[PDB]
Design a protein around this ligand. Structure first.
Ligand code: NA
Length: 213
């Protein structure tokens, strides 16, 4: 099964922006792949609307958004029109994948079978995962909220910031970290190595050393 640190599988799909190859779409950017069981459902509609409004926040972090929903592109196009109206956005700048037969969802381990459309029978309730993918196509973080509970855009941005920072500076982030807060030196780094790389640090315990960001 796919887990954090697994490679995000590549695929070809029909989308609201035309046919794409996932890796090609992503390029060297980070990616956020978010999933929906069906179009014209309320929580998901609010969620896509929020991502659309906030796309500039993602753009500045070199992150490309992509949505998946188990319906055809034609349906997604109509849904986007509603989303534009609701969100009061001029356009939705990212694609929504038309996964009519659940093939992509299946590839991403959200369902145990592919080849059939959305029947409103409950088999699609699990098509709700969000995958944060790095420039090397590694899945870095996953979260799955049920369609009943809307996601948190701020948290998605927070984790992206933490992940990027950790990759950039070789640090780790504590619970509830916000940017500009102090970070933690990874245990793989010796105190001497830490002095060389970070300067000063506060050793709470030998394994827990805070340093400034
Ligand atoms: Na020190």
């Amino acid at each position: 099964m796919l887990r954090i640190n697994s490679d995000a599988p590549n695929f070809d799909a029909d989308t609201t922006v035309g046919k794409i190859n996932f890796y090609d779409y992503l390029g060297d950017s980070w990616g956020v792949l978010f999933s929906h069981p069906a179009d014209f459902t309320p929580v998901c509609t609010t969620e896509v609307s929020a991502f659309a409004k906030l796309k500039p926040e993602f753009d500045k972090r070199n992150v490309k958004l992509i949505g998946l929903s188990v319906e055809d592109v034609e349906s997604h196009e109509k849904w986007i029109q509603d989303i534009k109206e609701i969100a009061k956005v001029k356009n939705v700048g990212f694609p929504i994948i038309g996964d009519t037969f659940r093939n992509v969802a299946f590839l991403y381990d959200m369902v145990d079978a592919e080849g059939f459309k959305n029947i409103n029978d409950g088999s699609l309730k699990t098509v709700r995962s969000v995958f944060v993918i790095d420039p090397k196509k590694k899945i870095r973080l996953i979260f799955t909220y049920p369609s009943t509970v809307g996601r948190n855009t701020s948290e998605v941005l927070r984790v992206i910031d933490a992940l990027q920072l950790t990759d950039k500076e070789g640090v780790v982030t504590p619970i509830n970290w916000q940017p500009a807060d102090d970070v933690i030196i990874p245990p793989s780094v010796s105190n001497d190595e830490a002095k060389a790389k970070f300067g000063q640090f506060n050793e709470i315990k030998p394994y827990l050393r805070f340093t400034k960001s």
